[PDB]
Amino acid sequence: RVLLCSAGHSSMVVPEAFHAVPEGFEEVHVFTTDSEKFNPVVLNDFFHSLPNVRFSITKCHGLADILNERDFEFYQEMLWQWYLTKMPDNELPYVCLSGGIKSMSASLQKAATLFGAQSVFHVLADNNPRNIEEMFDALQKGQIHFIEMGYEPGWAALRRLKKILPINEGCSRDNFKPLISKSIEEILSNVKIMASDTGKSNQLPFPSLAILPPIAQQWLQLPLSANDGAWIQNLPKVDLHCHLGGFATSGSLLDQVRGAASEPDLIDRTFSPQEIAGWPRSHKSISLDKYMELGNANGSKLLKDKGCLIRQVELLYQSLVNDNVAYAEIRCSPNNYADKNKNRSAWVVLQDINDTFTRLITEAKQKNQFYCHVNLLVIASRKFSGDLSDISKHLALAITAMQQGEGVCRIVGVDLAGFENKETRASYYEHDFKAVHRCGLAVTAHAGENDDPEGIWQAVYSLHARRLGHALNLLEAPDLMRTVIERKIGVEMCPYANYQIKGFAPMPNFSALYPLKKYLEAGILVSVNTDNIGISGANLSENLLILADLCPGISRMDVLTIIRNSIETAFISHDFRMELLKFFDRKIYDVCLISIKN
Amino acid sequence: RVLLCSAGHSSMVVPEAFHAVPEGFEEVHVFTTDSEKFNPVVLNDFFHSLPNVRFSITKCHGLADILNERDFEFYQEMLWQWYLTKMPDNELPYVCLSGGIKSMSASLQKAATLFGAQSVFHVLADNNPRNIEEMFDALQKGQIHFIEMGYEPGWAALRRLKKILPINEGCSRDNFKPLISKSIEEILSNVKIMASDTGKSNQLPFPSLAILPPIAQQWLQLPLSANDGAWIQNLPKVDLHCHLGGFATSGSLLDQVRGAASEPDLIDRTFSPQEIAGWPRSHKSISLDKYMELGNANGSKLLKDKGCLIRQVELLYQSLVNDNVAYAEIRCSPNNYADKNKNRSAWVVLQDINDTFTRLITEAKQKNQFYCHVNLLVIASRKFSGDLSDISKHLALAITAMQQGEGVCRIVGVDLAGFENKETRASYYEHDFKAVHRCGLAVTAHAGENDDPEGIWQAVYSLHARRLGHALNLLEAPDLMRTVIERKIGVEMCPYANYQIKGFAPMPNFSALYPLKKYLEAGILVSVNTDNIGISGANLSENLLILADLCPGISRMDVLTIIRNSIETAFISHDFRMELLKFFDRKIYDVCLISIKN
Ligand SMILES: Nc1ncnc2c1ncn2[C@@H]1O[C@H](COP(=O)(O)OP(=O)(O)OP(=O)(O)O)[C@@H](O)[C@H]1O
Ligand SMILES: [Mg+2]
Ligand SMILES: [Mg+2]
């Protein structure tokens, strides 16, 4: 509860507004011009008499009184800036309007009904009290009257103007910028456009809260450029497809990963796979083989031990948060890491992963920073010949993992990734999953890179795979594209991974074109991902950069729709999805409103 | 244009406010308190010097000034009533803040923010002239300053309160109603702000309402009331479960369809369904047997004639347009309305209905009226008394209807409607249902109405149904809640039809509460429909307004979210979905702008 009062030619109004409410206030603040008439001694001593409250006095430097239009507009801009500095973070402040002449009174009333105000009230006393003792006398006999003129919600989105700038470190006339007046022209232009052009007012879908300035709107509509890296780096993102076993494979990451191991040297730390010339912008297409062997230094060869796994998890989480990713899912193979002779089963590995992830998430949240929620995916790897029954084990593991009850990070679904082939098509294992759906799990599938459209159709219609993987050649089966679109089955795409595997973006002697633009035009729910960040040497931001020249003709609104698809085709509960919706909307609004300025 | 100005002690404010418009001003009206300090003689003479300017003086009878709360809201009542009396018919008024103490200043500036003013402004004089001789030179030397804070459109449509609420110039507040309607909106807005739930609002659909005035945004967050029925006769709606045969069951409509028959000897005018007291708000639950015995007057036995069918479909289209519905899906049974005696095959009947709907669409669109797009769904009933072979027939017909292609009205899916006594849970009809999905047709389901919610699982999975019918008892299956919510499977339900067949609150002896609020909170995609309009005797608007009694506390955001879900779950092309959303957003924005009290 913060009291805001405009100080004009009367001083007792501040105490009147303070002890107006019978319960009182824990915060009182006043704003005034450069009028030398006002003496702060009385208000200062009155505040000192109740130190439990906080008193701040704001003086409009450079102007003691209003003389012209320029003076009034400068005073109004200073008042607006001071007001936006005094917004309580969660609730709204109380405001008293009994101080000043009609001019600043009307200005503060308009500012209050603009940015909101918890309660707007006037104070008036018949006796016109002068001496403090008869403030208290008037309270005892009740000649001071408090009138409330309603409670307006205010403009919800305008409040956020704050970020644009709390204070410009003592703004001066030579460099004064009426930016909140630019917010006013923004809202005025938005309303006028809505009420003027019926055709333009027709075309407002997009991700919600599209009341941005028209300059910002057509900037977003402008095709995205390769120089927008900082924008998307500041823009929160979502990663629905990331592999745990391919984070630290090149650079200095492996040294830090090996630097902490429950074991001390039973780990080949020197030998590394040979590096491929040029990365991640290799101009020569390579297909598999060289991909995983580049990451052979990581994976089953490295995270068999405990502390190295914890170090890898911590570094992956730090990399995720450092890229402003708000939410992501990690694909990890428990049986690929379990060690029986060390009494480390797959269940123990998954429990350790869950514990470290939830501990890190809770620690990040408790500090009120930007914390990245993470859910886990277990991969039923198709290792072909070796011990078919192990696949069943993985399913059981999934069914027994999410049932652990408590935790903020939870096993959310299973995966069908592995050695894709005609024989290894999704119709082969169709008899096993009839139970995994019965327990409320979610199922994805990896097909389309090499499998036929029949395999994709079977995966969609037999396993009820709520998502897909890669699937770069749906254009040859329009019926398959149709049935994917109408069922709202999201498709996870890894731009850099396919760019390495295949050839597009004026690749040398490669005339194939990426289907992302056509995919988004047709309405498929593409979610841009990273697959193996360490192997591909690129995070989400670099994928979105390369999306510019990989699919020429993509605007920033396409990126926003891709983000919405990513946060829409992720297995999460409805309430959590709603909170994520709200937070993402707020963050995108803030980031675009701050990026337009420069 | 009309100028409204208020003055207190000062009297020289009005003529200075007159020179605000350089071109001149045509009518000016002034409201002031009963204070005798204000001198009307000088203003009267100044306005008689300009005979072309209409002058009217209004005084706050019985209130010299304000010295307490009661006087303040008394003056608020007088000022708001005089204001609403002084709106011009189409043009927003001009208002100035030059005269009066903070009380009236705040009052009329809040009024301008609420009712909307073309130009709110301020006039201040450096040399504060008191007579005409001084302010001539004061304006000629530029000392008088015309402060302005820009356009204040406010709520564009907040004037029907003049008509709905009668104007009473001569009265008191001690007498009665001061703002009443204004009191209602202020208290309800405040109460909503104390109790606001983005959780049930963050879900703000149709992003254009993010530009609605702040006084309007929370207005829809209030719980719905029956008096808002007129309003829900204005929003474009969607009706998906609307059987064709049940449109005409009684009234003059049955006479009209009977009279269009080519031969009147074979028309069974004899039968007359019995009436039930309190229809449509039945006082007792009615079983399914009596339910379709009530509709036995019409149906196939009366629609066999071609002209009868044509008249029926034309009247259904006309009534559907009368309900302001924009998109609809009609469930029809072709084989039911086919007689082989006159070479009237079922495919011919379907072609006739499709061509009639296409012709109506083209005729409505040519006149640029509010046409209603309609699609069709064949009905694959349970095929009572055995003889399931016809099932295949229907499905085959649907496929051949889908591939016709050209036109506006199309066949987008099939239906599974009928008795549950056969225990038709997917596998009973799964022997041949696999091929439908390959063709790309949609498939709904009407199951679980009275039996154990177990075959619903198979209907969701084995049938791959994209929508469900009724399933009111879905609450007691959390394992089914989680799947149906995560699968985004929509559910259609008709409040009037379910209330009639099963009985619900606030009926005595019926303790069952309608699960719509819980369903919406859980995040389900729920679509309110009408089933059979003629059977229920209530269009979609009545079905929507009955929710206030059926589910207390339902907000207008809930109705808008219901409409959004109905748009989402409809079986349509993706581009058609964007176009429908594009039209719906603008229509809903206009309806909400001109919504208040109608
Ligand atoms: N689901 C979420 N995911 C990530 N962060 C969240 C989530 N929910 C809340 N937060 C955090 O709540 C905090 C609220 O911050 P606040 O409302 O004060 O806005 P801000 O400080 O101006 O900018 P910022 O959002 O960067 O903190 C955010 O920092 C955000 O990181
Ligand atoms: Mg992968
Ligand atoms: Mg039905």
The token duo for A425 is: 């098509």
Per the CB < 8 A criterion, the answer to whether A442 and A466 are in contact is yes
Task: Provide DSSP, B183-241.
Answer: HHHHHHHHHHHHT--GGGTTT--SGGGGGS-HHHHTGGGSBP-GGGGTGGGTS-EEEEE
Is B485 within 8 Å of chain A by CB? Answer: yes
Strands A144-148 and B237-243: unpaired
| B596/B334 Cα distance (integer angstroms) | 44
Structure tokens at A84: 């936006």
Pick from A487, A489, A482: nearest CA to A442: A489
Ligand nearest to the CA of A445: 2
CA distances from A308 to A253, A364, A375 (A): 12, 21, 21
Nearest to B483 among A67, A440, A483 (CB): A440
- The SS3 of residue B47 is helix
Closest to B4 (Cα-Cα) out of B119, B106, B103? B119
Determine contact: A267 vs chain B, CB below 8 A: no
Residue A124: in which H helix or E strand, if any? strand A119-125
Integer angstrom CA distances of residue B131 from B56, B127, B136, B159, B394: 21, 11, 9, 37, 91
Token pair listed for A126: 């018949």
Nearest-Å Rg of the Cα atoms of chain B is: 31
| B143 and A CB contact within 8 Å | no
A53 phi-psi bin (left φ>0, alpha ψ -120 to 50, beta other): beta
Helix (H, G, I), strand (E, B) or coil at A206: coil
Q: Which of A293, A386, A311 is nearest to A352 (CA)?
A: A311
Shortest CA gap B522–chain A (Å): 7
Which ligand 1 atom is nearest residue A586's CA? 25
A65, A152, A483, A488: best to mutate for the B interface, most B CBs within 10 A: A152
DSSP string, A30-46: EEE-S-TT--SHHHHHH
CB A526 within 8 A of CB A491: yes
- What's the CA gap between B521 and B199, in Å, rounded? 8
Q: Which two tokens stand for residue B163?
A: 């008509």
Q: Which two tokens stand for residue A566?
A: 């990513």
Strands A119-125 and A144-148: antiparallel
Torsion of CA B17, B23, B25, B26, to 10 degrees: 170
Name the amino acid, one letter, at B311: R
Residue nearest to atom 16 of ligand 1 (CA): A89
- Burial of A157 from C-beta contacts in 10 A (0-12 / 13-18 / 19+): middle
CA distance A128 to A136: 13
Atom of ligand 1 nearest to the CA of A587: 25
Largest interatomic CA distance in chain B: 103
Per the listing, tokens 């808002």 go with B228
Query: Which residues make Cβ contacts (< 8 Å) with residue A584, sequence separation at least 6?
Result: A236, A326, A563, A567
Ligand 1 atom nearest to A590, measured from its CA: 23
Mutate to test the interface with A, among B102, B109, B578 (most CBs of A within 10 A): B102
Helix A389-401 crosses helix A346-366 at what angle (to 10 degrees)?
30
How many Å apart are CA A257 and CA B129, to the nearest integer?
A: 82
- Is A579 annotated to bind a ligand? Reply is yes
Rounded CA separation B150/B121 (Å): 8
The interface residues of chain A toward chain B in range 69-98, judged by CB-CB distance below 8 A, are 69, 72, 76, 97-98
Q: Of A84, A73, A81, A76, nearest to A154 (Cα)?
A: A84
For the CA of A580, the nearest atom of ligand 1? 1
SS3 B342: helix
B139-161 burial, b if ≥16 CB within 10 A, otherwise e? Answer: beeebbbbbbbebbebbeebbeb
CB neighbours (10 Å) of residue B274? 7
CA distances from A483 to A461, A478, B456 (A): 10, 9, 22
- Coil, helix or strand at residue B56: strand
Whether residues A209 and B208 touch (CB distance < 8 A) is answered with: no
Q: Are β-strands A94-96 and B144-148 bridged in parallel, bridged antiparallel, or unpaired? A: unpaired
Q: Are B427 and B420 in contact (CB under 8 A)?
A: no
Q: How many helices (H) and strands (E) does chain A have?
A: 24, 13
Tell which B residues from 346 to 365 touch A, by Cβ distance under 8 Å.
none
Backbone φ, ψ for residue A471 (5° rounding): 55, 65
What residue in B sits closest to A197 (Cα-Cα)?
B586
Residue in chain B closest to A481 (alpha carbons) equals B440
Taking the Cβ of residue A176 and every Cβ of chain B, the question of whether any pair is shorter than 8 Å is answered with no
Residue A233 near residue A541 (C-beta atoms within 8 A): yes
DSSP H or E run through A590:
helix A574-595
**How far apart are the C-alpha atoms of B562 and B584, rounded to whole Å?**
13
CA distance linking residue B411 with residue A284, whole number of Å: 49
Amino acid in position A97: L
Environment class of A348 (CB within 10 Å of its CB; exposed 0-12, middle 13-18, buried 19+): middle
**What gap in Å lies between CA B510 and CA B6, rounded to an integer?**
58
Q: What is the dihedral of CA B228, B233, B239, B242, to 10 degrees?
A: 100
Q: Please give the backbone phi and psi of residue A547, each rounded to the nearest 5 degrees, phi first.
A: -60, -20
Which residue, chain included where needed, has tokens 């308009």? A110
Tell me, letter by letter, the H, E, C secondary structure of B276-290.
CCCCCCCCCCCCHHH
Facing B211 at nearest CB: one of A72, A191, A485 = A191
Residue with tokens 């759906």: A437
Report CA(B286)–ligand 3 centroid distance (Å): 16
Resolution in angstrom units: 3.6
> Could you tell me the strand order of the sheet in which A526-528 lies?
A467-469, A490-493, A526-528
Residue to mutate, A235, A371, A584, A592, ligand 1, most ligand atoms under 8 Å from C-beta: A371
Cβ contacts below 8 Å, chain A against chain B, sum to 174
Measure A28 CA to ligand 1 centroid, in angstroms.
Answer: 26
Element of type H or E holding B499: helix B495-502
Cβ neighbours for A240, distance < 8 A, ≥ 6 positions apart: A328, A329, A467, A490, A492, A527, A529, A566, A569, A570
Please say whether the beta carbons of A229 and A541 come within 8 A: yes
Long-range contacts of A140-143 (CB under 8 A, 24+ apart): none
Are B350 and B313 a contacting pair, CB within 8 Å? no
Q: Whose CA is nearest to atom 17 of ligand 1?
A: A89
Rounded CA-CA distance A7/A30 in Å is 6
- Which residues of B fall within a CB distance of 8 Å from A106? 97, 105-106, 109, 122
Give the number of other Cβ atoms within 10 Å of residue A514's Cβ. Answer: 20
DSSP helix/strand/coil, B423: coil
Residue type, B227: N
In 3D, which of B215, B35, B53, B20 has the Cα closest to residue B123?
A: B20
SS3 assignment, position B121: strand
Q: Residue A249's closest CA among A528, A542, A503, A538? A: A538
Strand (E) positions, A456-505?
Answer: 467-469, 490-493
Nearest one of B103, B100, B105 to B37, comparing CA atoms:
B100
DSSP state of B148: E
Ligand closest to Cα of A579 equals 1
A517: three-class secondary structure by DSSP? helix
Q: Which residue has the tokens 């990963």?
A: A257
d(CA B48, CA B367): 53
CA–CA separation, B202 vs B218, rounded Å?
12
Choose among B151, B203, B488: nearest Cβ to A578.
B203
Please give the Cα distance from A120 to A123 (Å, whole number). Answer: 10
Identify any residues that bridge with A527 across adjacent strands, giving them in sequence order.
Answer: A492
How far is it, in rounded angstroms, from Cα B523 to Cα B529? 18
Q: Do A204 and B583 touch (CB under 8 A)?
A: no
For every residue of B242-268, DSSP letters joined together read EESTTS-SSHHHHHHHHHT-S-STT--
Considering only CA atoms, which residue is closest to atom 18 of ligand 1? A89
Q: How far apart are CA B255 and CA B251, in angstroms?
A: 7
Contact indicator for A154, A26 with CB cutoff of 8 Å: no
Buried/exposed code over B12-35 (b: 16+ C-beta within 10 A; e: otherwise) = bbbbbbbebeeeebebbbbbbbee
**Separation between Cα atoms, residue A253 and residue A238, nearest integer Å:** 23
The position carrying tokens 């120089």 is A227
Residue A268, amino acid:
D
Question: Exposed e or buried b for every residue in A245-281, given b needs 16+ CB within 10 A?
Answer: bbbbbbeebbeebbeebeeeeeeeeeeeeeeeeeeee
| Neighbour count for residue B116 (Cβ, 10 Å) | 21
Instruction: Name which of B547, B541, B553, B534 is nearest B246 in CA terms.
Output: B534
Please give the structure tokens belonging to residue B331.
Answer: 């469930």
DSSP string, A418-450: B---STTSTTTTTTTTTTTGGGT--B---BSSS
Q: Collect all residues with Cβ–Cβ distance below 8 Å to B266 and sequence separation of at least 6.
A: none
Does residue A142 sit at the B interface (CB-CB below 8 Å)? no
Residue B442 to residue A488: CA distance in whole angstroms = 13
**A557 in reach of chain B (CB within 8 A):** no
Query: Which amino acid does the sequence have at A61?
Result: H
List residues of A with catalytic annotation: 449
Report in angstroms the alpha-carbon separations of B59 from B56, B62, B104, B169, B596: 10, 9, 13, 11, 30
For residue A300, give every residue at least 6 positions away whose Cβ sits within 8 Å of its Cβ, in sequence order, or none: A245, A336, A337
Q: Alpha-carbon distance A272 to A250, whole Å?
A: 9
Tell me how far apart the 2 most distant CA atoms of chain A are, in Å: 97
Pick the residue from chain A with its C-alpha nearest to B196: A153
Three-class secondary structure of residue A105 per DSSP: helix
Structure tokens at A559: 């990126």
Closest by Cβ to B124, choosing from A103, A109, A154: A103
What is the experimental method? cryo-EM
Please tell me whether A200 is known to bind a ligand.
no
Tell me which residue has its CA closest to atom 13 in ligand 1: A368
For chain A, the first-to-last Cα distance in angstroms comes to 35
CB–CB of A211 and B210 under 8 A? yes
Residue closest via CA to ligand 1's atom 28 equals A370
Q: Is A553 left (phi over 0), alpha (psi -120 to 50) or beta?
A: left
Q: Chain B residues with CB inside 8 Å of A113's CB?
A: 110, 113, 214
Ligand 1 pocket by C-beta < 6 Å: which residues?
A 89, 163, 326, 368, 370-371, 579-580, 583, 587
CB-nearest to B488 from A146, A208, A488 is A488
Question: Quick one: closest CA in A to B199, which residue?
Answer: A578
Helix count and strand count (H, E) for chain B: 24, 14
Query: Counting Cβ atoms within 10 Å, is residue B184 exposed (0-12), middle (13-18) or buried (19+)?
Result: exposed
Sequence-ordered list of residues with C-beta below 8 angstroms from that of A469, at least 6 positions apart, any chain: A241, A417, A444, A445, A446, A447, A448, A449, A491, A492
